[PDB]
Amino acid sequence: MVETEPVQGCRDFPPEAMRCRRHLFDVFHATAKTFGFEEYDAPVLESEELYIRKAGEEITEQMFNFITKGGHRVALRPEMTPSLARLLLGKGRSLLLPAKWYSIPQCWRYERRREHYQWNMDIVGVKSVSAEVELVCAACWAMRSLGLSSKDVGIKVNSRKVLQTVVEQAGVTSDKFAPVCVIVDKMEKIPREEVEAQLAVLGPTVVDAITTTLSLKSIDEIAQRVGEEHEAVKELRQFFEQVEAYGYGDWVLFDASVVRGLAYYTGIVFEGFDREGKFRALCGGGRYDNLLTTYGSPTPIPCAGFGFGDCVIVELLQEKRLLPDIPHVVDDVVIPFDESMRPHALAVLRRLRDAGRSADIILDKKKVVQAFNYADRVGAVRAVLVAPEEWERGEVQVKMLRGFAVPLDRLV
Amino acid sequence: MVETEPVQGCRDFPPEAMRCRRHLFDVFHATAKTFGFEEYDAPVLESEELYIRKAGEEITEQMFNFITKGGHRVALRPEMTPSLARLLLGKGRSLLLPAKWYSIPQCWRYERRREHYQWNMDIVGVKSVSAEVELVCAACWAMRSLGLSSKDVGIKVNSRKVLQTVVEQAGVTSDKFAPVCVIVDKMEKIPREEVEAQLAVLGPTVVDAITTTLSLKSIDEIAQRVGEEHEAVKELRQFFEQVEAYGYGDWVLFDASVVRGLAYYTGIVFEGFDREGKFRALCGGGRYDNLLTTYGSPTPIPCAGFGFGDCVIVELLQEKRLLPDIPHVVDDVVIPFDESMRPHALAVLRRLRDAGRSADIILDKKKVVQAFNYADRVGAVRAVLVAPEEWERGEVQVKMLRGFAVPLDRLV
Ligand SMILES: Nc1ccc2oc(=O)ccc2c1
Numbered sequence: 090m091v092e093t094e095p096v097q098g099c100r101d102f103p104p105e106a107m108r109c110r111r112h113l114f115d116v117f118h119a120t121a122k123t124f125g126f127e128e129y130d131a132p133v134l135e136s137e138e139l140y141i142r143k144a145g146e147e148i149t150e151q152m153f154n155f156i157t158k159g160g161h162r163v164a165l166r167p168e169m170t171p172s173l174a175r176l177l178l179g180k181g182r183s184l185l186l187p188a189k190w191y192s193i194p195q196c197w198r199y200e201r202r203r204e205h206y207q208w209n210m211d212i213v214g215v216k217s218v219s220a221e222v223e224l225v226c227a228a229c230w231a232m233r234s235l236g237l238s239s240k241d242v243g244i245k246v247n248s249r250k251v252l253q254t255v256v257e258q259a260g261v262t263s264d265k266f267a268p269v270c271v272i273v274d275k276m277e278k279i280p281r282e283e284v285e286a287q288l289a290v291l292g293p294t295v296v297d298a299i300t301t302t303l304s305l306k307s308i309d310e311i312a313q314r315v316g317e318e319h320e321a322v323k324e325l326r327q328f329f330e331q332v333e334a335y336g337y338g339d340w341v342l343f344d345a346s347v348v349r350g351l352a353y354y355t356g357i358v359f360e361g362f363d364r365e366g367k368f369r370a371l372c373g374g375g376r377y378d379n380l381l382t383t384y385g386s387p388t389p390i391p392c393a394g395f396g397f398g399d400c401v402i403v404e405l406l407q408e409k410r411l412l413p414d415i416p417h418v419v420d421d422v423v424i425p426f427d428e429s430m431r432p433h434a435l436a437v438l439r440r441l442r443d444a445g446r447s448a449d450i451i452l453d454k455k456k457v458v459q460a461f462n463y464a465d466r467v468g469a470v471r472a473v474l475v476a477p478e479e480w481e482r483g484e485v486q487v488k489m490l491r492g493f494a495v496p497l498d499r500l501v
Numbered sequence: 502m503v504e505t506e507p508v509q510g511c512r513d514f515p516p517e518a519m520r521c522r523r524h525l526f527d528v529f530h531a532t533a534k535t536f537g538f539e540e541y542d543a544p545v546l547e548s549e550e551l552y553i554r555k556a557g558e559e560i561t562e563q564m565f566n567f568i569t570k571g572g573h574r575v576a577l578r579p580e581m582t583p584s585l586a587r588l589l590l591g592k593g594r595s596l597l598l599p600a601k602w603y604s605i606p607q608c609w610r611y612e613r614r615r616e617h618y619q620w621n622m623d624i625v626g627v628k629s630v631s632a633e634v635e636l637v638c639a640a641c642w643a644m645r646s647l648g649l650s651s652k653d654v655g656i657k658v659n660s661r662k663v664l665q666t667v668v669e670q671a672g673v674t675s676d677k678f679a680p681v682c683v684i685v686d687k688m689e690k691i692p693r694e695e696v697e698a699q700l701a702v703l704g705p706t707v708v709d710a711i712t713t714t715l716s717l718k719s720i721d722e723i724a725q726r727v728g729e730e731h732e733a734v735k736e737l738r739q740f741f742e743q744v745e746a747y748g749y750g751d752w753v754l755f756d757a758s759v760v761r762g763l764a765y766y767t768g769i770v771f772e773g774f775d776r777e778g779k780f781r782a783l784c785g786g787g788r789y790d791n792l793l794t795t796y797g798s799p800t801p802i803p804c805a806g807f808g809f810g811d812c813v814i815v816e817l818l819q820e821k822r823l824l825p826d827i828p829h830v831v832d833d834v835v836i837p838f839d840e841s842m843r844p845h846a847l848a849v850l851r852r853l854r855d856a857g858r859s860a861d862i863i864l865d866k867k868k869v870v871q872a873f874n875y876a877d878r879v880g881a882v883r884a885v886l887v888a889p890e891e892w893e894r895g896e897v898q899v900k901m902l903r904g905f906a907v908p909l910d911r912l913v
């Protein structure tokens with residue numbers, strides 16, 4: 090017997106599970122359309138070189154990579170943002186800006202689940218915090234569309250520029266900044282000792298300064314540290330003013346501990362969370378204004394975006410009882426009275442489908458009662474019995490499942 | 502500079518290309534719903550063991566396989582049917598039958614394009630030709646939905662049982678039958694000499710018999726060879742009677758040369774083709790009643806299905822001028838008169854999206870004329886200018902792009 094289980098860390102989606110996944114994806118697609126984003130895609134297989142960032146990132150450390158027969162170093166993508174930038178870099182000046190692009194790629198890791206789907210939303214060519222505002226609103230909109238409220242979830246927001254100043258002023262060379270963010274991202278996960286030790290290895294005074302600024306609880310307190318008109322203060326203020334104007338003020342808040350784990354974030358960063366403190370981050374993103382420059386863009390291209398995985402959100406929705414099983418449905422099941430009626434039933438099936446209805450025909454030889462049972466099992470709205478006596482009169486028998494003779498023309 | 506091109510043999514789908522792909526997939530999804538099929542999915546990564554059929558198949562020969570870090574032999578799936586059977590075998594008696602399942606997996610090869618998407622449609626648990634009838638009608642329906650007619654395309658249909666008889670009667674051991682089909686499938690591609698030589702290696706008289714039955718041009722001629730009531734003759738006759746009753750008689754025909762290249766087909770086989778003779782097969786499928794038994798099913802499970810790739814169909818549609826560029830559209834573009842109006846414009850943006858409309862807001866600081874230009878470029882139906890004078894009156898200016906003051910409430 091063949092192995093029935095899927096490959097290690099990978100999920101099967103039989104129809105029941107697929108309906109749940111489709112319920113989620115339908116929201117991702119619907120939200121992107123509502124917000125005027127355009128779909129794109131790229132190959133799950135990318136060059137390994139695309140992800141070599143040398144910053145100690147979990148995402149690049151846990152890369153599902155291999156070598157081809159032809160000796161090329163490839164990887165099943167651990168994230169989408171590098172593929173997006175590749176695409177953008179390829180287009181150059183032909184790309185009209187601003188651009189708002191989205192996708193729902195399967196992304197991979199190797200270390201535990203080894204694959205997940207991740208809704209990606211990115212705004213390209215927008216310098217101002219208006220981009221981050223729209224992105225955060227889009228994530229909130231998706232969560233609201235799924236049945237959650239601002240009592241269930243929120244989005245924590247910060248700017249890496251605050252920390253950038255502290256690292257720069259303390260005297261640390263800026264090439265260590267991305268490594269620092271990556272390490273400080275571990276704070277909530279591991280003891281402050283371990284995190285303190287990691288920064289020591291990187292290269293005590295400056296470490297204290299980092300720690301203090303992470304734990305500042307309000308924006309006023311940040312403004313006391315760096316000034317009321319520091320770059321980050323005005324941007325965060327504008328960000329909250331705009332989100333409030335859109336009507337999502339209750340969904341967002343400031344949190345100085347939020348840095349995210351990716352090397353490339355330069356500005357505002359954010360992450361979604363459940364207000365019971367039970368789950369990992371629901372989504373995460375930020376501004377990354379230098380990535381395209383590091384890829385070789387002759388001109389700086391401002392960018393911002395987020396990823397929103399398919400797994401944590403599902404656990405939250407299940408906890409909140411927002412993912413009831415939604416059984417399969419079909420409009421019509423056409424039932425031949427017997428096999429002599431099959432040709433006529435097929436003509437009827439054609440008509441129903443011609444009208445835009447979803448319809449089955451009983452394919453096996455079976456008794457009328459069992460055909461009605463099958464009709465119930467598949468969630469048919471209507472059973473259409475095609476029998477000789479009614480057929481003679483230009484009719485079929487129609488029975489609403491949630492048996493009257495009806496002229497063919499009146500079926501639809 | 503990073504490599505902008507995708508990995509060898511793999512496609513990027515920036516928004517323009519993605520719209521075309523989505524036009525196709527929308528038809529695949531819509532046809533499956535019309536026909537009452539249920540979506541499923543499984544991992545692109547499967548165990549290599551799943552595909553080791555030892556029959557000289559092109560599909561298993563050109564397998565994109567590799568070994569994991571942990572030494573497990575895996576493959577990016579070359580086709581979906583084995584994953585489907587794995588899923589079915591896993592469910593056992595819990596699976597209610599008949600079942601009609603579909604998916605649109607990316608499938609992979611290594612040798613030239615190395616990936617394609619392939620719409621898969623399969624009916625499980627149906628013994629009679631009614632399954633093949635529905636499947637062939639579904640493929641025709643998809644092609645019609647894309648703008649093609651029976652003048653553009655058709656589906657050629659045959660049964661492997663005819664050949665099975667000839668191979669069995671000639672005295673050849675039945676374990677060579679699948680290898681024979683695989684070889685005879687090459688007939689149209691390579692010279693009859695090469696094909697004749699391949700069968701010789703497998704193990705002259707029986708070879709002639711095979712050749713003769715492949716070139717019989719009608720079903721009556723098959724009935725002369727094997728009898729009017731041979732198993733295959735009654736099934737083919739019933740198949741054409743049913744397709745004709747559904748109203749697709751003009752789309753289908755008999756062709757004794759059609760065997761397909763897969764080892765597992767046992768009965769009716771079929772393939773779509775363009776009637777100008779310019780392209781490779783548009784789709785292909787058949788009945789495979791023994792596969793689940795070879796996977797270890799305690800009870801035989803009848804199955805039939807097809808695959809329908811995303812590449813050949815697109816070339817055909819382009820030749821027929823049925824894939825015009827469909828530019829991006831959005832309902833509204835909201836334009837702040839200036840930055841002082843941004844908060845109010847955001848409130849307006851919220852209202853529009855609340856009503857189910859697709860809407861952008863101008864994110865950058867820009868002049869009203871350039872904002873109107875951007876609105877045209879993104880294919881906006883309407884520009885909503887949010888200006889101080891109108892705002893004072895509880896109004897905005899609305900301009901149909903394919904400028905009158907309008908009360909907020911009347912926008913939607
Ligand atoms: N890169 C990345 C990150 C997180 C992930 O979480 C999963 O559960 C499966 C895959 C995955 C891939």
Ligand SMILES: Nc1ccc2oc(=O)ccc2c1
Pocket residue numbers: 560578579580608609610614615616617812
């Ligand atoms: N197994 C399989 C068969 C045919 C294919 O044709 C392509 O163009 C790309 C991938 C592919 C994979």
Ligand SMILES: N[C@@H](Cc1c[nH]c[nH+]1)C(=O)O
Pocket residue numbers: 168169170209210211351373374375377393394395396
């Ligand atoms: N690639 C990021 C999310 C993201 C998209 N755009 C910007 N950031 C992640 O995987 O967490």
Ligand SMILES: N[C@@H](Cc1c[nH]c[nH+]1)C(=O)O
Pocket residue numbers: 580581582621622623763785786787789805806807808
């Ligand atoms: N797996 C087959 C198509 C198919 C689906 N179901 C049965 N046959 C192919 O790739 O050609």
